[PDB]
Amino acid sequence: SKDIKQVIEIAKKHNLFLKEETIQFNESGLDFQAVFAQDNNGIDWVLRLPRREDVMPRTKVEKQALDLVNKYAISFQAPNWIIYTEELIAYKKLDGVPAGTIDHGNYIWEIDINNVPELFHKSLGRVLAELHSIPSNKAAALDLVVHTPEEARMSMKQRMDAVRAKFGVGENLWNRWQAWLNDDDMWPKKTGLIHGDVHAGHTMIDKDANVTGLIDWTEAKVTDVSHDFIFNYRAFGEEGLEALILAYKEIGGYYWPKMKEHIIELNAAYPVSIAEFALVSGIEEYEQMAKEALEV
Numbered sequence: 001s002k003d004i005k006q007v008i009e010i011a012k013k014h015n016l017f018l019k020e021e022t023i024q025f026n027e028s029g030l031d032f033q034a035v036f037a038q039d040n041n042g043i044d045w046v047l048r049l050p051r052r053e054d055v056m057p058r059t060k061v062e063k064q065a066l067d068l069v070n071k072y073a074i075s076f077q078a079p080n081w082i083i084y085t086e087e088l089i090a091y092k093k094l095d096g097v098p099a100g101t102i103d104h105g106n107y108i109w110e111i112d113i114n115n116v117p118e119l120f121h122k123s124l125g126r127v128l129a130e131l132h133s134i135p136s137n138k139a140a141a142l143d144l145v146v147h148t149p150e151e152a153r154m155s156m157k158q159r160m161d162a163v164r165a166k167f168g169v170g171e172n173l174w175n176r177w178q179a180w181l182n183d184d185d186m187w188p189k190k191t192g193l194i195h196g197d198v199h200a201g202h203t204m205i206d207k208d209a210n211v212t213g214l215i216d217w218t219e220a221k222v223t224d225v226s227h228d229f230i231f232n233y234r235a236f237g238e239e240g241l242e243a244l245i246l247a248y249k250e251i252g253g254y255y256w257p258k259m260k261e262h263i264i265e266l267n268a269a270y271p272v273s274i275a276e277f278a279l280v281s282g283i284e285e286y287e288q289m290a291k292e293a294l295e296v
């Protein structure tokens, strides 16, 4: 195959020598095609073949976030792009498997959704508490979005007005959104470095369902940490949200009395993210997903 021979040559050009029979393709990918391959010392790698120009400006923020994680974090792994060029990005595969993969819509689960091991919530609590306390201020140059607690609140307020302008928002839903925005007690008084896209496809687990790593850091930023709890609530209901909040609080993560209620209101604002995604991607189902999510 030509594809295979191409993978081999781009790797070879970056001093990566692979077993040809181990090369698997993960279908593009507007930005890049993911390729998995084992080098000749037997080490599993992940390759990102770029499909757009300006790889460096487009990956700058994700790389800065990864540099912070690889410099500070010990409880979990993250991609370490030891090959980082316009022609190729490559990192040694993280240990474990995704807790679940998105259907190519629904999850194909690796854990028992009806009997979630408590170690998943315990280890994820430790992982996010460490992540969210990484000292991103100590970096000389950070191009991530950085919110104070009040900036994180206005950001949501503005993002909500913009979605209402392009799609409209159901009256009951909009009133809920506004009530949340206008409740001082609910909002966190501390922000932190977040992953931004925490879900089962990005949480690497070992055999015991300990979360051992996190992939795909494109949504990283310094803002409300609550975004990283939403998956537990969507996938596992109130029990899994509480279990995660409990472990995060007891290992030292920033906790506030209305944390659960705040995260649940952030969940009701998920149509904002779906609307925003439908806007910068043009994929037809997400417009219908957006419109139906907005109750319009």
Ligand SMILES: CC[C@H]1OC(=O)[C@H](C)[C@@H](O[C@H]2C[C@@](C)(OC)[C@@H](O)[C@H](C)O2)[C@H](C)[C@@H](O[C@@H]2O[C@H](C)C[C@H](N(C)C)[C@H]2O)[C@](C)(OC)C[C@@H](C)C(=O)[C@H](C)[C@@H](O)[C@]1(C)O
Binding pocket: 102, 105, 106, 107, 196, 197, 198, 199, 219, 227, 228, 230, 231, 234, 235, 270, 273, 274, 277
């Ligand atoms: C429980 C089960 C359901 O899972 C979820 O609710 C997750 C916990 C989501 O994260 C929640 C929580 C959230 C924080 O993200 C992790 C939040 O941003 C998001 C909108 O919804 C997803 C992972 C969202 O993806 C994310 O949508 C973003 C718009 C862009 C992100 N990425 C940069 C490409 C992308 O991964 C997605 C839209 O679902 C609704 C994915 C879409 C394929 C579906 O509709 C799925 C069929 C889902 O209904 C689901 C599997 O059945």
Ligand SMILES: Nc1nc2c(ncn2[C@@H]2O[C@H](COP(=O)(O)OP(=O)(O)O)[C@@H](O)[C@H]2O)c(=O)[nH]1
Binding pocket: 026, 029, 034, 046, 092, 093, 094, 095, 096, 097, 098, 101, 201, 202, 204, 215, 216, 217
């Ligand atoms: N097991 C494992 N899978 C990975 C790793 N990196 C990427 N993948 C898989 O490849 C997919 C795409 O990688 P990702 O970084 O999320 O890029 P994107 O989803 O295409 O934008 C993921 O959903 C994973 O299933 C890794 O280190 N370990």
Ligand SMILES: [Mg+2]
Binding pocket: 201, 202, 216
């Ligand atoms: Mg991904």
Ligand SMILES: [Mg+2]
Binding pocket: 197, 216, 217, 218, 219
């Ligand atoms: Mg991404």
